């Protein structure tokens, strides 16, 4: 499907561009964060996966055109999720 994931070429992932440098821990952290960033995120108006990162904390929908501010590396954060959940439950209880 993607590039050759041979018997070896499978652990580094996107951190394979650093070669033999910076140690195992940092490379693993950067790699995992990169697979989270490259994910197919979902829109809020469209409800179609079209969201990609334009800048530091700026996101946009390719089809929908919608622009919004979010996380630096991921569109939606857990704390914002909790705020939405709590405020929406309070509103809906009224």
């Amino acid at each position: 499907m993607a590039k050759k994931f041979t018997k070896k070429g499978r652990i580094s992932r996107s951190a394979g561009r650093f070669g033999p440098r910076y140690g195992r821990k940092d490379r693993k952290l950067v790699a995992d964060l990169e697979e989270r960033m490259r994910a197919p995120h979902v829109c809020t108006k469209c409800a179609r996966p079209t969201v990609e990162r334009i800048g530091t904390g700026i996101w946009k929908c390719s089809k929908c055109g919608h622009t919004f501010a979010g996380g630096t590396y991921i569109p939606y954060t857990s704390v914002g999720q909790t705020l939405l959940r709590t405020m929406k439950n309070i509103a809906e209880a009224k």
Binding site: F18, Y22, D26, R27, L29, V30, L33, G55, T56, G57, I58, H66, T67, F68, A69, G70, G71, T72, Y73, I74, T77, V79, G80, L83, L84, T86, M87, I90
Partner: protein
């Protein structure tokens, strides 16, 4: 006179320690509103601010003047903001902290009324309203302390955007170098024990050791408060 230290050089304000002000987009402050007024406005664009490494919003108000604003998370181009006393509680509006319910998150809080906002401004931080007495309200600051603010203070509801900025390690001197070009900080910094006895209280010797205790009292004169300034404790937790 053994040479002055880096802190005193920053005090003088030489060009090496001055912020490159012309790079920054604009100052962030709350809209100025007279007594018993409520102005609205809808976002026109979302923009990057080089002075904080976080997004900011451009909003055009009904009078005509547009202002950059500290962008809370979720702000999108098109939504209208209703800053004023009569605003409802929603993510984005600016309302007094006296009539904010307990448990709600806020940010860009002011010290005294009509300051524009001074607390809770870096990426992904937020504060909480705890209690509402008649004369004050206690909010838990992101540091972890309780602060007693005036009920007639303004603060945008939500949390500051850009959350998670420090989950990505530098892993190079080059990337951190590039960040420091748009700040007043100096990069890189020499360590005190590697200097000469003219330059620092810790310098000198045939081997690199502090020589004297690193904890310094709070009453030490300028040019000597180097190290652990008036520490209450030291070491990790055993």
């Amino acid at each position: 006179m053994g040479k002055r230290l880096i802190s005193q050089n920053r005090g003088r304000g030489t060009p090496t320690y001055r912020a490159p002000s012309h790079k920054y987009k604009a100052d962030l402050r709350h809209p100025r509103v007279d007594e018993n007024s409520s102005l609205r406005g809808e976002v026109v664009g979302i923009e990057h601010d080089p002075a904080r490494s976080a997004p900011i919003a451009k909003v055009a108000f009904e009078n005509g003047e547009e202002l950059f604003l500290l962008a809370s998370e979720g702000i999108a181009v098109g939504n209208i903001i209703e800053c004023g006393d009569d605003a409802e509680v929603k993510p984005g509006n600016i309302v007094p902290i006296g009539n904010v319910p307990e448990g709600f998150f806020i940010c860009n809080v002011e010290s005294k009324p009509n300051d524009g906002g001074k607390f809770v401004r870096s990426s992904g931080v937020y504060a909480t309203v705890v209690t509402h007495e008649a004369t004050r309200t206690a909010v838990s600051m992101p540091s972890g302390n309780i602060k007693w603010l005036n009920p007639k203070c303004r603060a945008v509801v939500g949390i500051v955007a850009g959350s998670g900025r420090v989950d990505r390690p530098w892993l190079k001197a080059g990337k951190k170098y590039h960040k420091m070009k748009t700040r007043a900080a100096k990069y890189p910094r020499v360590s005190a024990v590697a200097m000469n006895p003219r330059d620092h209280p810790f310098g000198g010797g045939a081997w690199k050791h502090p020589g004297k205790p690193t904890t310094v009292s709070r009453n030490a004169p300028p040019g000597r408060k180097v190290g652990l300034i008036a520490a209450r404790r030291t070491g990790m937790k055993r």
